[model samples]
Target: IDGMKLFLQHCKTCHGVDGNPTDLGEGLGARKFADAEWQAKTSDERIIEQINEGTPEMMMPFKEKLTPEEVKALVPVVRGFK
Candidate 1:
């Protein structure tokens, strides 16, 4: 998916190449898509919301940086982490 490339380019530094939070991300409390526990607690809608609005200091808002379609495309990518 296009989001994979986009994520690798923009998010991999913090989110990791495999969707687990990197060391920097861990320091910032970034969520891990690969964690089943986290996956169970989060919904696609919530994921979308976080991507659009961000989680305060934990995440940066993608609304200004990504198109709606691009943001939406990340849903499956995030889900596919498992």
Candidate 2:
């Protein structure tokens, strides 16, 4: 599957369809994925780690559902969202 589709199907729920997290349900104030400053500050590796390991406040661990290739492909798309 492609990054765009993967993001839309999986990430859009809490991260928002446009990557701007909404204060709905149990969502948090996520970083603006499309922001150049944020993208430049973070690396692909860090993003991958977060997606797989998740944080104390987030539930993004994706190793159970996504393959490595799928995760790799999604990094850029997540960064590209606005």
Candidate 3:
């Protein structure tokens, strides 16, 4: 599936279609993908780790849900959210 489509299927509940995050997302500390400072500070490697491992109680691990290639593909899609 396309990355955007994958994101919608898996991440949209919290991260939102616009990368602005829903209320639950903010409560759970989800990152706003469009935030320029966040984009500047966040490394792709860091993003990958978070995706694979997830935040404890805040988010769920995606490694088991997505294949490794899909995970890699989402990184660029994440960058494109802005």
Per residue, candidate 2 scores C-alpha lDDT tens digits across 1-82 of: 6888898777777776665675641455465665778878899999898777777666658888889898898887877742
Clashes of 3: 0
Q: Candidate 1 lDDT, tens digit per residue, 1-82?
A: 4878888877787887676889999899886778888888889899888889988888888999988898888887888742
Q: Model 3, 1-82: lDDT tens per residue?
A: 5888888888888888776889989899876888889888989999889889998989999999998888887897788742
Best by TM-score: 3
Assess every candidate by TM-score.
0.86, 0.81, 0.89
The alpha-carbon lDDT assigned to residue 45 of candidate 3 equals: 91
Taken over the whole model, the C-alpha lDDT of each candidate is 0.83, 0.75, 0.85
Error of 3 at 1 (Å): 4.0
Q: How many pairs collide in each candidate, listed in order?
A: 0, 0, 0
Clashing pairs in 1: none
| Candidate 3: Cα lDDT at 43 | 97
**Candidate 1 Cα errors over 4 Å, as ranges:** none
Candidate 2 RMSD to the correct structure = 2.4
| Whole-structure CA lDDT of model 3 | 0.85
